[PDB]
Structure formats: structure tokens, C-alpha cells
Ligand binder design. Structure first.
Ligand SMILES: Nc1ncnc2c1ncn2[C@@H]1O[C@H](CSCC[C@H](N)C(=O)O)[C@@H](O)[C@H]1O
Length: 327
DNA sequence: TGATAGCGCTATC
DNA sequence: TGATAGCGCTATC
């Protein structure tokens, strides 16, 4: 993340729905806002969130009396995506984990906050022909909210990672918000090799497979894109290797392969997966953030998360719009 | 409330 | 297309 000195969200309160690792909290908090509630049901997420924020989120949002949710100005929610991901089956709303948006809507109905800040994978925008996003768009509009939605890639915001997510920002119509805008992109100046730990602390992630097939030569000139250097086995998810002089492929939560959830990388002639700390950095998390003790859950936790940086710029801009109230 | 690893399909240009 | 990347799926221990 980056430091934000002109704190745009200073007096605002916000709720952390589907808290996960709390990336939404770090971002809005860096803009001056205040977290008055968190919700997340995964026992391990709850522990990492307690470890870092001293709070344990409430459980399963599905059976939480919405009226119980504390008054708040911005509702943040990075809702489940398995049901909309290009990487899964795609049953959308027909999936158990696909109905969560309607929980957001109903919390929005009761608490009607000033802004609604949501996040999902790029394919949520095309899922079921555009039906999912339209239903979402209509539900929000139907609640007296605007609905600004756009796809932003992590790599365009200073983080060496390919992560294309849809950000949906809704302001109550009351507010008459007509100046909202998504952060303008900017030149990437950091790449994987920059966030990499010293070889000493990562020996153990190095994997030497006889079936490692190098298909491309390493690169010396940095590029804001994922450059595949080789594969292992058949080359499926988690079985492909990339140059650290490019950007990181996206991290995943249930991902598999020998380079599970991280993908492989060629570091000094060796081939390894990222350490949970490198995942933190690739998601823009600060080194002060305490990772969960279970590397597996840590990886799952980081793979479900959001790139903080992106969120900061959006949060600043939400604050910027909200703040322009001339005479 | 678990850790690991081989998928095997889709969306995109 | 032809090659890649995907906040995934799911069997086995
Ligand atoms: N019914 C439910 N109640 C609470 N949390 C839920 C839930 N269904 C899914 N979740 C959680 O919602 C998250 C989807 S991922 C979001 C991660 C979050 N943006 C962060 O910044 O890391 C996961 O943590 C998942 O465990």
C-alpha cells in the first residue's frame, strides 16, 4: 500500500463484509475512515483478522439480522466469486456461494449507506451473458443508488501482478454524486524480482522437477506483463513458470498444482513458488501485516484477497467525490 | 473446522 | 483459430 496524506475519508464509518484478510479495511483506514463492523465466517480468516485488527468478525452473514449491523457510511464487500470465475463451473446465482450479493443488497436496504464499494473477478461482468451484472446493476439502482462499474488491472496501479477485478461503486442518489471517476492508470515501476525475499529465506520452496520443460529464455528487460518461461508436468493451473522480470500471474484460493495458488518462478536459475510474504507484497500488503501460521490458509487467504493499492486510489476518489459539496 | 497436487474446462483475441 | 491465464474443482492420504 501507499501512504495517503490528504485523508479523504476522515469522518466516515464503514463495514467490512466478507472481511477475509481485511484488505478493505487497510485501504479505507489509510484514507482516514473508521471500521465499525467486520463480517467473515472462515475460522482461519477470523484468526488472521483478529491477529491484525484485534477484532474477530461476526459469522455467516446469511443468518445475521441486518438491523444489527451498525450505522455506516460505506459498505465494503469483496463477495465470493467461485460461482462467476472463468476458473470454475460458473453456476452463478444458482450456486450456494453465488447468492451473497443479495445479502449485500438486503443489508443495503436496511442500513442504506452513502456508498457501496464492491469487488469481484473480471468474469462477473460477462457471466451468464451479462445477466449477473445486470441483476446487480438493477438491484442497486432499484435501491436508489448509482452504479459505476469498471475493470481495473493491478499492474496499472503500481503492483507487479496481473489481477483484473470489477469494482462497483454506488452512491445514494440523495448525494447527487456526478464527479466520481476511477483512478487513471500510470506507468508500472516495480516487478516481481523487486518484491522477492533473499534466497536464504526461500530455499524450501524451490522445487526441482525432472519434467520441468523450459519453453522460453529468461528476460533481462522488465515488462508489465506475465512472461511464461516454462511448464512442469502437463502445464495446467499451478504447473507453469514465469519470469520474475515480468509481473506475477494472479494468486488463487483453491488453486492446485505443484505451485499451488502462486505459480512458479525462475529465481537465480532455480524454480520455485512464492512465500506467503511475497504473496503479501504482490497483493500490496505491508510487511507489518502478520500472516496466518498455516501457509496453506495464508495462501488461500491471500489468493481470495484484493490488491490494496488499487483500493486506495478508489477509496481516495470515493472520498474526493463525497467531499465536493459546494454552495 | 486440512494439506497437497493433477487436473480439464472456459473466455479471450 | 492457437496459446494463455483463471480470487477453481476435487481426489487421496
Ligand atoms: N456466508 C459467509 N459469511 C461470511 N464470510 C463469507 C461467507 N461466504 C464467504 N465468505 C468469505 O468471503 C470471502 C470471499 S473473498 C474476500 C477477501 C477480502 N476482500 C479480503 O480483503 O481479503 C472469503 O473470506 C470467504 O470466507
Amino acid at each position: 500500500m501507499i501512504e495517503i496524506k490528504d485523508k479523504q475519508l476522515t469522518g466516515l464509518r464503514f463495514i467490512d463484509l466478507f472481511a477475509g484478510l481485511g484488505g478493505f479495511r487497510l485501504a479505507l483506514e489509510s484514507c482516514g475512515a473508521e471500521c465499525v463492523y467486520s463480517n467473515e465466517w472462515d475460522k482461519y480468516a477470523q484468526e488472521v483478522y483478529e491477529m491484525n485488527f484485534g477484532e474477530k468478525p461476526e459469522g455467516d452473514i446469511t443468518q445475521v439480522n441486518e438491523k444489527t449491523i451498525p450505522d455506516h457510511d460505506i459498505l465494503c464487500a469483496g463477495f465470493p466469486c467461485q460461482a462467476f470465475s472463468i476458473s470454475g463451473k460458473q453456476k452463478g446465482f444458482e450456486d450456494s456461494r453465488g447468492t451473497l450479493f443479495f445479502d449485500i443488497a438486503r443489508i443495503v436496504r436496511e442500513k442504506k449507506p452513502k456508498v457501496v464499494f464492491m469487488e469481484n473477478v473480471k468474469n462477473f461482468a460477462s457471466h451468464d451473458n451479462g445477466n449477473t451484472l445486470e441483476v446487480v446493476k438493477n438491484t442497486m439502482n432499484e435501491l436508489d443508488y448509482s452504479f459505476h462499474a469498471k475493470v481495473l488491472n493491478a499492474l496499472d496501479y503500481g503492483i507487479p501482478q496481473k489481477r483484473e477485478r470489477i469494482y462497483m461503486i454506488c452512491f445514494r442518489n440523495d448525494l447527487n454524486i456526478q464527479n466520481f471517476q476511477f483512478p487513471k492508470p500510470f506507468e508500472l515501476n516495480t516487478f516481481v524480482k523487486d518484491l522477492l525475499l533473499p534466497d536464504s529465506e526461500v530455499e524450501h520452496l524451490v522445487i526441482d522437477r525432472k519434467d520441468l520443460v523450459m519453453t522460453n529464455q529468461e528476460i533481462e528487460q522488465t515488462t508489465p506483463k506475465t512472461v511464461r518461461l516454462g511448464i512442469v508436468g502437463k502445464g495446467g493451473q499451478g504447473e507453469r513458470i514465469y519470469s520474475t522480470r515480468g509481473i506475477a500471474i494472479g494468486l488463487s484460493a483453491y488453486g492446485g498444482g505443484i505451485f499451488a495458488k502462486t505459480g512458479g518462478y525462475l529465481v537465480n536459475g532455480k524454480t520455485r513458488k512464492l512465500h506467503p510474504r511475497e504473496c503479501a507484497r504482490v497483493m500490496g500488503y505491508p510487511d507489518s501485516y502478520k500472516v496466518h501460521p498455516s501457509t496453506s490458509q495464508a495462501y488461500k487467504q491471500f489468493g481470495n484477497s484484493v490488491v490494496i493499492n488499487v483500493l486506495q486510489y478508489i477509496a481516495y476518489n470515493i472520498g474526493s467525490s463525497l467531499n465536493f459539496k459546494p454552495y
